[PDB]
Design an enzyme around this catalytic site. Sequence first.
Site, PDB file in Angstrom:
ATOM      1  N   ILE B  12     -11.110 -12.542  -9.479  1.00 27.24           N
ATOM      2  CA  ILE B  12     -10.824 -11.150  -9.221  1.00 27.24           C
ATOM      3  C   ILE B  12     -11.023 -10.914  -7.733  1.00 27.24           C
ATOM      4  N   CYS B  13     -10.103 -10.130  -7.185  1.00 29.63           N
ATOM      5  CA  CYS B  13     -10.033  -9.883  -5.750  1.00 29.63           C
ATOM      6  C   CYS B  13      -9.403  -8.521  -5.467  1.00 29.63           C
ATOM      7  N   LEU B  31      -8.676  -9.787   2.958  1.00 27.11           N
ATOM      8  CA  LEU B  31      -9.899  -9.785   2.171  1.00 27.11           C
ATOM      9  C   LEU B  31     -11.071  -9.187   2.924  1.00 27.11           C
ATOM     10  N   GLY B  32     -11.242  -9.585   4.193  1.00 29.84           N
ATOM     11  CA  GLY B  32     -12.501  -9.315   4.867  1.00 29.84           C
ATOM     12  C   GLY B  32     -12.356  -9.225   6.381  1.00 29.84           C
ATOM     13  N   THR B 162      -6.170  -6.625  -7.008  1.00 31.64           N
ATOM     14  CA  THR B 162      -5.974  -5.251  -6.600  1.00 31.64           C
ATOM     15  C   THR B 162      -5.089  -5.233  -5.342  1.00 31.64           C
ATOM     16  N   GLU B 300      18.955  17.715   3.469  1.00 30.36           N
ATOM     17  CA  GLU B 300      19.622  18.432   2.386  1.00 30.36           C
ATOM     18  C   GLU B 300      18.755  19.570   1.832  1.00 30.36           C
ATOM     19  N   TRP B 322      27.312  15.119   1.327  1.00 32.14           N
ATOM     20  CA  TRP B 322      28.315  16.068   0.819  1.00 32.14           C
ATOM     21  C   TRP B 322      29.706  15.888   1.447  1.00 32.14           C
ATOM     22  N   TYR B 348      24.057  25.261  -4.340  1.00 30.75           N
ATOM     23  CA  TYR B 348      22.607  25.385  -4.368  1.00 30.75           C
ATOM     24  C   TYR B 348      22.037  26.447  -3.432  1.00 30.75           C
ATOM     25  N   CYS B 408      24.302  19.448 -10.606  1.00 35.57           N
ATOM     26  CA  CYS B 408      23.675  18.539 -11.539  1.00 35.57           C
ATOM     27  C   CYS B 408      22.259  18.968 -11.879  1.00 35.57           C
ATOM     28  N   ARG B 428      21.490  17.999 -15.813  1.00 33.96           N
ATOM     29  CA  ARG B 428      22.544  17.956 -16.816  1.00 33.96           C
ATOM     30  C   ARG B 428      23.256  16.609 -16.787  1.00 33.96           C
ATOM     31  N   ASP B 431      23.253  10.062 -12.731  1.00 34.62           N
ATOM     32  CA  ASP B 431      23.691   8.758 -12.308  1.00 34.62           C
ATOM     33  C   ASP B 431      22.465   7.891 -12.033  1.00 34.62           C
ATOM     34  N   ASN B 439      17.078  11.873  -6.542  1.00 32.73           N
ATOM     35  CA  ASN B 439      16.782  13.141  -7.194  1.00 32.73           C
ATOM     36  C   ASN B 439      15.262  13.257  -7.469  1.00 32.73           C
TER      37      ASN B 439
HETATM   38  N1  LIG Z   1     -11.814  -8.053  -0.840  1.00 32.92           N
HETATM   39  C1  LIG Z   1     -12.280  -8.923  -1.721  1.00 32.92           C
HETATM   40  O1  LIG Z   1     -11.861  -8.940  -2.887  1.00 32.92           O
HETATM   41  C2  LIG Z   1     -13.393  -9.854  -1.312  1.00 32.92           C
HETATM   42  C3  LIG Z   1     -13.664 -10.034   0.017  1.00 32.92           C
HETATM   43  N2  LIG Z   1     -14.732 -10.768   0.475  1.00 32.92           N
HETATM   44  C4  LIG Z   1     -14.943 -10.875   1.946  1.00 32.92           C
HETATM   45  O2  LIG Z   1     -14.595 -12.195   2.332  1.00 32.92           O
HETATM   46  C5  LIG Z   1     -15.454 -12.628   3.422  1.00 32.92           C
HETATM   47  C6  LIG Z   1     -16.237 -13.821   2.955  1.00 32.92           C
HETATM   48  O3  LIG Z   1     -15.282 -14.912   2.809  1.00 32.92           O
HETATM   49  P1  LIG Z   1     -15.427 -16.345   3.489  1.00 32.92           P
HETATM   50  O4  LIG Z   1     -15.785 -16.204   4.926  1.00 32.92           O
HETATM   51  O5  LIG Z   1     -14.260 -17.175   3.043  1.00 32.92           O
HETATM   52  O6  LIG Z   1     -16.770 -16.856   2.767  1.00 32.92           O
HETATM   53  P2  LIG Z   1     -17.169 -17.154   1.234  1.00 32.92           P
HETATM   54  O7  LIG Z   1     -17.674 -15.907   0.573  1.00 32.92           O
HETATM   55  O8  LIG Z   1     -16.029 -17.847   0.565  1.00 32.92           O
HETATM   56  O9  LIG Z   1     -18.443 -18.102   1.413  1.00 32.92           O
HETATM   57  C7  LIG Z   1     -18.360 -19.343   2.153  1.00 32.92           C
HETATM   58  C8  LIG Z   1     -19.654 -20.103   1.982  1.00 32.92           C
HETATM   59  O10 LIG Z   1     -19.964 -20.334   0.575  1.00 32.92           O
HETATM   60  C9  LIG Z   1     -20.535 -21.628   0.431  1.00 32.92           C
HETATM   61  N3  LIG Z   1     -19.646 -22.516  -0.316  1.00 32.92           N
HETATM   62  C10 LIG Z   1     -18.316 -22.341  -0.616  1.00 32.92           C
HETATM   63  N4  LIG Z   1     -17.801 -23.309  -1.333  1.00 32.92           N
HETATM   64  C11 LIG Z   1     -18.863 -24.174  -1.549  1.00 32.92           C
HETATM   65  C12 LIG Z   1     -18.967 -25.407  -2.235  1.00 32.92           C
HETATM   66  N5  LIG Z   1     -17.966 -25.993  -2.878  1.00 32.92           N
HETATM   67  N6  LIG Z   1     -20.177 -26.004  -2.270  1.00 32.92           N
HETATM   68  C13 LIG Z   1     -21.193 -25.405  -1.634  1.00 32.92           C
HETATM   69  N7  LIG Z   1     -21.212 -24.279  -0.925  1.00 32.92           N
HETATM   70  C14 LIG Z   1     -20.003 -23.694  -0.925  1.00 32.92           C
HETATM   71  C15 LIG Z   1     -20.852 -22.113   1.840  1.00 32.92           C
HETATM   72  O11 LIG Z   1     -22.087 -21.481   2.173  1.00 32.92           O
HETATM   73  P3  LIG Z   1     -22.967 -22.203   3.301  1.00 32.92           P
HETATM   74  O12 LIG Z   1     -22.347 -21.959   4.602  1.00 32.92           O
HETATM   75  O13 LIG Z   1     -24.242 -21.494   3.172  1.00 32.92           O
HETATM   76  O14 LIG Z   1     -23.028 -23.695   2.903  1.00 32.92           O
HETATM   77  C16 LIG Z   1     -19.692 -21.503   2.620  1.00 32.92           C
HETATM   78  O15 LIG Z   1     -19.889 -21.401   4.029  1.00 32.92           O
HETATM   79  C17 LIG Z   1     -16.274 -11.390   3.796  1.00 32.92           C
HETATM   80  O16 LIG Z   1     -15.589 -10.689   4.825  1.00 32.92           O
HETATM   81  C18 LIG Z   1     -16.367 -10.669   2.451  1.00 32.92           C
HETATM   82  O17 LIG Z   1     -16.721  -9.324   2.657  1.00 32.92           O
HETATM   83  C19 LIG Z   1     -15.456 -11.534  -0.403  1.00 32.92           C
HETATM   84  C20 LIG Z   1     -15.217 -11.507  -1.702  1.00 32.92           C
HETATM   85  C21 LIG Z   1     -14.223 -10.580  -2.300  1.00 32.92           C
HETATM   86  C1  LIG Z   2     -14.033  -4.704  -2.959  1.00 31.16           C
HETATM   87  C2  LIG Z   2     -14.857  -5.184  -4.066  1.00 31.16           C
HETATM   88  C3  LIG Z   2     -14.078  -6.149  -4.923  1.00 31.16           C
HETATM   89  N1  LIG Z   2     -13.001  -5.684  -5.597  1.00 31.16           N
HETATM   90  C4  LIG Z   2     -12.342  -6.533  -6.409  1.00 31.16           C
HETATM   91  N2  LIG Z   2     -11.328  -6.008  -7.116  1.00 31.16           N
HETATM   92  N3  LIG Z   2     -12.599  -7.847  -6.544  1.00 31.16           N
HETATM   93  C5  LIG Z   2     -13.627  -8.313  -5.827  1.00 31.16           C
HETATM   94  N4  LIG Z   2     -13.947  -9.612  -5.934  1.00 31.16           N
HETATM   95  C6  LIG Z   2     -14.405  -7.452  -4.975  1.00 31.16           C
HETATM   96  O1  LIG Z   2     -15.532  -7.867  -4.306  1.00 31.16           O
HETATM   97  C7  LIG Z   2     -16.421  -8.855  -4.769  1.00 31.16           C
HETATM   98  C8  LIG Z   2     -17.678  -8.156  -4.972  1.00 31.16           C
HETATM   99  C9  LIG Z   2     -18.770  -8.731  -4.097  1.00 31.16           C
HETATM  100  C10 LIG Z   2     -19.090  -7.649  -3.113  1.00 31.16           C
HETATM  101  O2  LIG Z   2     -19.746  -6.625  -3.880  1.00 31.16           O
HETATM  102  C11 LIG Z   2     -19.982  -5.432  -3.262  1.00 31.16           C
HETATM  103  C12 LIG Z   2     -20.615  -4.398  -3.945  1.00 31.16           C
HETATM  104  C13 LIG Z   2     -20.839  -3.196  -3.303  1.00 31.16           C
HETATM  105  C14 LIG Z   2     -20.428  -2.989  -1.987  1.00 31.16           C
HETATM  106  C15 LIG Z   2     -20.593  -1.679  -1.315  1.00 31.16           C
HETATM  107  C16 LIG Z   2     -20.484  -1.545   0.079  1.00 31.16           C
HETATM  108  C17 LIG Z   2     -20.601  -0.300   0.694  1.00 31.16           C
HETATM  109  C18 LIG Z   2     -20.712   0.868  -0.071  1.00 31.16           C
HETATM  110  C19 LIG Z   2     -20.806   2.238   0.605  1.00 31.16           C
HETATM  111  O3  LIG Z   2     -20.943   2.258   1.848  1.00 31.16           O
HETATM  112  O4  LIG Z   2     -20.675   3.286  -0.090  1.00 31.16           O
HETATM  113  C20 LIG Z   2     -20.765   0.756  -1.468  1.00 31.16           C
HETATM  114  C21 LIG Z   2     -20.664  -0.494  -2.079  1.00 31.16           C
HETATM  115  C22 LIG Z   2     -19.824  -4.052  -1.321  1.00 31.16           C
HETATM  116  C23 LIG Z   2     -19.590  -5.260  -1.945  1.00 31.16           C
HETATM  117  O1  LIG Z   3      22.163  15.058  -7.260  1.00 32.57           O
HETATM  118  C1  LIG Z   3      23.026  14.454  -7.906  1.00 32.57           C
HETATM  119  C2  LIG Z   3      24.435  14.710  -7.859  1.00 32.57           C
HETATM  120  C3  LIG Z   3      25.251  14.033  -8.683  1.00 32.57           C
HETATM  121  N1  LIG Z   3      24.813  13.072  -9.567  1.00 32.57           N
HETATM  122  C4  LIG Z   3      25.862  12.308 -10.351  1.00 32.57           C
HETATM  123  C5  LIG Z   3      25.936  12.528 -11.867  1.00 32.57           C
HETATM  124  C6  LIG Z   3      27.390  12.126 -12.135  1.00 32.57           C
HETATM  125  O2  LIG Z   3      27.506  10.704 -12.075  1.00 32.57           O
HETATM  126  C7  LIG Z   3      28.106  12.793 -10.965  1.00 32.57           C
HETATM  127  C8  LIG Z   3      28.497  14.251 -11.180  1.00 32.57           C
HETATM  128  O3  LIG Z   3      29.669  14.312 -12.047  1.00 32.57           O
HETATM  129  P1  LIG Z   3      29.812  15.412 -13.179  1.00 32.57           P
HETATM  130  O4  LIG Z   3      28.762  15.045 -14.135  1.00 32.57           O
HETATM  131  O5  LIG Z   3      29.612  16.753 -12.467  1.00 32.57           O
HETATM  132  O6  LIG Z   3      31.138  15.181 -13.785  1.00 32.57           O
HETATM  133  O7  LIG Z   3      27.165  12.683  -9.860  1.00 32.57           O
HETATM  134  C9  LIG Z   3      23.449  12.756  -9.659  1.00 32.57           C
HETATM  135  O8  LIG Z   3      22.933  11.909 -10.408  1.00 32.57           O
HETATM  136  N2  LIG Z   3      22.647  13.512  -8.836  1.00 32.57           N
END
Ligand SMILES: NC(=O)C1=CN([C@@H]2O[C@H](COP(=O)(O)OP(=O)(O)OC[C@H]3O[C@@H](n4cnc5c(N)ncnc54)[C@H](OP(=O)(O)O)[C@@H]3O)[C@@H](O)[C@H]2O)C=CC1
Ligand SMILES: CCc1nc(N)nc(N)c1OCCCCOc1ccc(-c2ccc(C(=O)O)cc2)cc1
Ligand SMILES: O=c1ccn([C@H]2C[C@H](O)[C@@H](COP(=O)(O)O)O2)c(=O)[nH]1
Lengths: 518, 524
Positions: B12-13, B31-32, B162, B300, B322, B348, B408, B428, B431, B439
Site C-alpha cells: 500500500i502506497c 513518495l517522499g 492512492t 458560451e 454555433w 438560450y 437540448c 431532451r 449526443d 454538457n
Molecule cells: N507516500 C507513501 O506512500 C510512502 C512514502 N514514504 C517516504 O519514502 C521515504 C523513505 O523511502 P526510502 O528512502 O526508499 O527508504 P525506506 O523506507 O525504503 O528504507 C530504506 C532502509 O530500510 C532498510 N532496508 C531496506 N531493505 C532492506 C533489506 N532487504 N534488508 C535490510 N534492511 C533493509 C535499510 O535501513 P538501514 O539503512 O538502516 O540498513 C535501508 O536504508 C520517506 O521520504 C518516507 O516519508 C515511505 C513509505 C510510504
Molecule cells: C501517507 C501515508 C500512507 N498512505 C498510504 N496510502 N500508504 C502508505 N504506505 C502510507 O504511508 C505509510 C505509513 C508510514 C508512515 O505513517 C505515518 C503516520 C502518520 C503520519 C503523520 C504525519 C504528520 C501529521 C500531522 O502533521 O498532522 C499526521 C500524521 C505520517 C506517517
Molecule cells: O448541447 C448540446 C446540443 C446538442 N446536442 C446534440 C443532441 C443531438 O445529437 C443533436 C440535436 O438534434 P435534435 O435532437 O435537436 O434533432 O445535438 C447535445 O448533446 N448537446
Amino acid sequence: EQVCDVFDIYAICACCKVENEVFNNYTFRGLGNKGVLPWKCISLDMKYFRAVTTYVNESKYEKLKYKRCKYLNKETVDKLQNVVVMGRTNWESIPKKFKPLSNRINVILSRTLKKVYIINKVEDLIVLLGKLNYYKCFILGGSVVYQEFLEKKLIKKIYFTRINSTYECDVFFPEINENEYQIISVSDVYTSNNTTLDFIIYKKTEEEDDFVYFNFNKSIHPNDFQIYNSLKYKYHPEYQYLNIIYDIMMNGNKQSDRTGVGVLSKFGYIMKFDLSQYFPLLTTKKLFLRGIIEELLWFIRGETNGNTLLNKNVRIWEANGTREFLDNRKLFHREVNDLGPIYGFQWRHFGAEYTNMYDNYENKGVDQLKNIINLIKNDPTSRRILLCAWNVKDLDQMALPPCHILCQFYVFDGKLSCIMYQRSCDLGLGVPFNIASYSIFTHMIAQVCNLQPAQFIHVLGNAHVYNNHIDSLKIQLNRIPYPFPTLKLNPDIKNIEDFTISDFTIQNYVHHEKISMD
Amino acid sequence: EQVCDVFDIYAICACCKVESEVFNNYTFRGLGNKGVLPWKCISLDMKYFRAVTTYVNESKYEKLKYKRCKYLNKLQNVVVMGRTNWESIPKKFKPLSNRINVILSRTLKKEDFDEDVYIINKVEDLIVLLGKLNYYKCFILGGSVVYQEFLEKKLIKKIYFTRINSTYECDVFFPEINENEYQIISVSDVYTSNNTTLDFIIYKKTDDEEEDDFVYFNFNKKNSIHPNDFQIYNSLKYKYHPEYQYLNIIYDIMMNGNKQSDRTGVGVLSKFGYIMKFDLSQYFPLLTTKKLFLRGIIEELLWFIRGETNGNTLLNKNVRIWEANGTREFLDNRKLFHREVNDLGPIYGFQWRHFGAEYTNMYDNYENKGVDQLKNIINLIKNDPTSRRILLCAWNVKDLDQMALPPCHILCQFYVFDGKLSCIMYQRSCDLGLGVPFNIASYSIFTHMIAQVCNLQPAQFIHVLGNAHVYNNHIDSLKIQLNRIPYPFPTLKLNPDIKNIEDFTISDFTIQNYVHHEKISMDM
Ligand SMILES: NC(=O)C1=CN([C@@H]2O[C@H](COP(=O)(O)OP(=O)(O)OC[C@H]3O[C@@H](n4cnc5c(N)ncnc54)[C@H](OP(=O)(O)O)[C@@H]3O)[C@@H](O)[C@H]2O)C=CC1
Ligand SMILES: CCc1nc(N)nc(N)c1OCCCCOc1ccc(-c2ccc(C(=O)O)cc2)cc1
Ligand SMILES: O=c1ccn([C@H]2C[C@H](O)[C@@H](COP(=O)(O)O)O2)c(=O)[nH]1
Ligand SMILES: NC(=O)C1=CN([C@@H]2O[C@H](COP(=O)(O)OP(=O)(O)OC[C@H]3O[C@@H](n4cnc5c(N)ncnc54)[C@H](OP(=O)(O)O)[C@@H]3O)[C@@H](O)[C@H]2O)C=CC1
Ligand SMILES: CCc1nc(N)nc(N)c1OCCCCOc1ccc(-c2ccc(C(=O)O)cc2)cc1
Ligand SMILES: O=c1ccn([C@H]2C[C@H](O)[C@@H](COP(=O)(O)O)O2)c(=O)[nH]1
C-alpha cells in the site's frame, strides 16, 4: 431438527381468484375445476414451474446428503434430479404426452394404484426420500395433497403463483396461517395469456475484502419496518415507489413548508413502469380514478374553468380556486374557480393571451397536443416530441405553477414511451395519483397513434414526505403489494379529443385497505 | 504456489505528481521528500491507510492458517517498514496501533528500539517470521527502497495505490509498475481532502437457500458489438469512479440500444431515460478518458448569461460551437429566410433574460422586456430557498420555430439545503460521444457560479437524459475510450470576489490538476 428441513420439502402451486370487497392473501386460492386447471394455459407460470421443479445445483448436494445421513443415523444414502409428489387426481389431469414429468423423479400418492414410484401414505415418502439421491422435493398438489402436507407441518417453503384473474373453481388451496408462514420474496409483475400474475415465496417462520476497503468512508425506528426489511427479494415494481419513501424517511433532509407542516425531502429520482405488462395502480392502499380521468379529459379539452370539475364533484382544484387562494396569489381580478392559463390552456393554446375562462380561444396560440400527436405519427424518431406546461410568461397568472413540467415521447418498433418531469412530488398523497394519470395518458396517445404503450418513466425533482404522513407511510411500507391491475380503453377511440369517462376500465384491481394519509 | 499468495503480502502506497504534456499511470509516482512525506497531512488517505492495514476477518483466518500450514507442513495484520519510513513517523503514532510492526534495517538492531516491534535484516527473514506468526495479512508500507525490492522479487499480490492529484517536490519515487506484471482491477470514487482530489486504485498481479430463489426469479432473462472489444472495461471488478456513470451509459446503449434513423442521416443507437449524479463538493467532473478544453463552453455560458443571440460574438473569440447553426444555408433550411447570418434567434440567452418578449434581431435592446428568469431564480435561492419552483426554462414553445434550433437543455431546477445548492438539468436529446461530456462541464460550472453569487456551496449536479444516443460514426472511438481507466478528476476554482451572476469573465475560472488521456476524434 424437522423433517421438511432435512428432506427439503417444498410446495409449489398456482392460485387464481374465485367468483366493498376486502382483499387478503386468501383472495388467491382457486386451484382446479372438474379435475382440470381453472384456466386455459398460462404459459408463463408453466415455464416458471418447469424451471423451479427441474433446477438442480450439484455442488450443493454433498452438503444435503450429509445432513440426511446424519439424521437417519447412516453413513451413506444407499445425475441429480428433484423429486415431485403428485396426488392421483393431479397425476391423471396431466396430458399423457407430458407424463412422466421429465428430468424429475415422479412420485404418486394413491391408495388404489399399483406398480416412477407409487406410495400410499405420507410417511412412505419420507422413507423413499431417505433411500434416494435427489436435490429437493416439490409437492405439486392437488388440493388433498397440499392440505395434508400442510397440516402435518411438512413444508419448508411455498412457491405461490398469484394469477390475477377470476375463474370458476371447485377446489381450493388451504388458508396459509400467517403465524405459520410469512412472505419473504415477491417477483416482477408480468402479463401472460391476458392476465397479470406474480410469483411470491412463503417461508416457515480477495474481492470481498476490497469491497470493505472501498466502504471505509460511509427519529424513525426501522424496527417499525419489520415486514419491509424482512423481505429478501423485492422485485414487484410497486417497490420503486415504496423504496423512495423508505429512502426519504431514512436519509431525507428536514425542511420547512409554507403550511408549516415540515417535510423530509431529497432531490432527483427516477421510476420506470412497464405498461406492456401491467397498469401501476398502487395496491398497498386503495386509489380511486374517476376524478383523475375527468381531470385529464378537462386538460385535453383545454379548459381552465374549475366549475366544470366541481359540478362533477371532482374537487382536486377546488382549494386553488377560492377567493382567498386567488387573492393571496395577488389575482384580485380573477373570478373564483378561474384557474387562469394552466395545463389545458398551455396544451392547446400556448402563447395566447389569457382573458378569462369563458373566452373562445379557438385557433389561438400553439396547439402542442395536436403537434406532438402529428410528430409521433409522421416523424416518430424526432427527439423534439415534447409537451410543456411550464409557460414562464404565464406562471404568475396561473392559480399555481404546474407540478408536471413536461412530457417527452419516444417511439421504437411500434411502441411508445413517455418521460414526465415533476418539479414537486408529494410522495404520500400526490405521486400515486400522478403515476396513474400519466400512465393513462401514455395509453391514450399510444392508441390514437396506433402504437403499443411501453414504459412510463417518472422523474422526481423535489421529492418530499410531509411529516403528517409519516405514520401512515410506516403502515403502508409493511404491506406486501398484490399483482397490479390492467387498464382497458375502448378500442374504437382513434382521436385524442374523443375519449369519455365510459371509455376507461380498470380490471382486476386487488388492493389493501384505504389509508387516510393524515 | 507463490510466497505472496501463501502469506498474503500486499503493498500500500500513496503517490503524487512531480515537477519536471503526456499523462500515464507513471504520472503518479512521488513518495517522499527529505525523508518525510511530500505533503502536509492528507487526512482522508491516512484514514484509508489505517482502515486497510488494520481490518481483519477472523472467520477467514482458519482457511488462511490451513493454507500456510500445508505450504510449510485478537487477530492482527503485519505491517513492514523500511528503516527510513519508520523514522519518518511521529513518535505518538509508533508503533502503528492494532498492527504487528516489522522494521527492515542493517544499521539498527532491536537494542536500538524501545517499542514493541520486530527487527529483520533481510527479506528472507520476513518470510521465516510470517511462517511463525498468527496474522491475517501482510502490508508492505514502503518506502521506495522497500517497494523496489519486494516488487523485483515478485512478492506482492496487490498494490493498494492512492493517486494524489497534486504536484509536490519529491526526491524519492515509487517504481515504474510493469503493465504486464500488474494491471488495475478496481478504482474508487473520487474525493477531496486538504484541498486536493485523490482516488484509490488496486493493481493485481496478472442461508444460500436464497441463492436458488435468485435463480428462480431470473427464469425469464443484442447488438453485434464484440466481447473482447471491451476486455479492459470488463476486466475491472469495482468501477466506482464517477466517470463510469458516463461510460456505463455508453456501454448500455451499445449493448441494448435500439437502432434508429435521425434528422442527421447517420442513424444511432438510442435508449430513453437515464440519470447521472456528480458531487461537486468533491470534484469537477471533466472527463479524463479523453481530452476536453473548456474555454469555448465557458465563453458560451457567459454569452448566455449576457442574453446574447449574436453568433458573431462567439466567432470573434474563435469559439465555433454555433457556427454551423448560423450559416445562410442552415437558416434557410429552417425557413428563416429573413434572418441575418449568425442571428441565431430567441435561443438560450434570450429565454434566460427575456422569456416572452417578441424577438426582433440580434442587435435590439430588449432591456426590461420579457421575464428575466435568471434574476428571478437567484432571488428565489437567496430569499425563498425551500421553494419548489426554482426553475430556469429554455423551451419556449411559442418561439421554437424562430430558433436556429430548439434547445437540448430544456430546464435546470435548483435545490438548497444546509447552505448547499444542487442542480438538476433535463436534456431532451443527448449526443453521448460528443455533446454530453461538454454538457456535464457547462452545467457543473453554472452550478458553481449560481452557488457563489447566492453565498452557497455547490453540492450535486444531477443530469437527466431523455433521448440518449450514440451516433454510429462514433462507435469505434467510444470502444477505444471505454477501455481507458479514468484518472482522478480536476477541481474548478472561481474568483471569490465575483458576487453578481453578470460579473464573471473568462479569467475568473481555473481548472486545476486536469489529468487526462489523449484526444480522440469521435469521427474517423
Ligand atoms: N507516500 C507513501 O506512500 C510512502 C512514502 N514514504 C517516504 O519514502 C521515504 C523513505 O523511502 P526510502 O528512502 O526508499 O527508504 P525506506 O523506507 O525504503 O528504507 C530504506 C532502509 O530500510 C532498510 N532496508 C531496506 N531493505 C532492506 C533489506 N532487504 N534488508 C535490510 N534492511 C533493509 C535499510 O535501513 P538501514 O539503512 O538502516 O540498513 C535501508 O536504508 C520517506 O521520504 C518516507 O516519508 C515511505 C513509505 C510510504
Ligand atoms: C501517507 C501515508 C500512507 N498512505 C498510504 N496510502 N500508504 C502508505 N504506505 C502510507 O504511508 C505509510 C505509513 C508510514 C508512515 O505513517 C505515518 C503516520 C502518520 C503520519 C503523520 C504525519 C504528520 C501529521 C500531522 O502533521 O498532522 C499526521 C500524521 C505520517 C506517517
Ligand atoms: O448541447 C448540446 C446540443 C446538442 N446536442 C446534440 C443532441 C443531438 O445529437 C443533436 C440535436 O438534434 P435534435 O435532437 O435537436 O434533432 O445535438 C447535445 O448533446 N448537446
Ligand atoms: N393450480 C395448481 O397449482 C394445481 C392444481 N391442480 C388441480 O387440483 C385438482 C386436484 O386436486 P384434488 O381433487 O384435491 O386431488 P389430489 O391431486 O389431491 O388427489 C387426491 C388423491 O390422492 C391420493 N392421496 C391423497 N392423500 C393421500 C394419502 N395420504 N395417502 C395416499 N394416497 C393419498 C388419493 O388417491 P386414491 O383415490 O388413489 O386413494 C386421493 O383421493 C385438479 O382439478 C387439478 O387440475 C393440480 C395440481 C396443482
Ligand atoms: C398450473 C401449473 C402449476 N403451476 C404451479 N406454479 N404449481 C403447480 N403445482 C402447477 O401444476 C401442477 C403440476 C402438474 C400439472 O402439469 C401439467 C402440465 C401441462 C399441462 C398443459 C395443459 C394445457 C396445455 C396447452 O393447452 O397447451 C399445455 C400443458 C397441464 C398440467
Ligand atoms: O400533481 C401534483 C400537484 C402537486 N403536488 C404536490 C407537490 C407539493 O407538495 C404541492 C404543490 O406545492 P408547490 O411545490 O407548488 O409549492 O403539491 C403533487 O405531488 N402532484
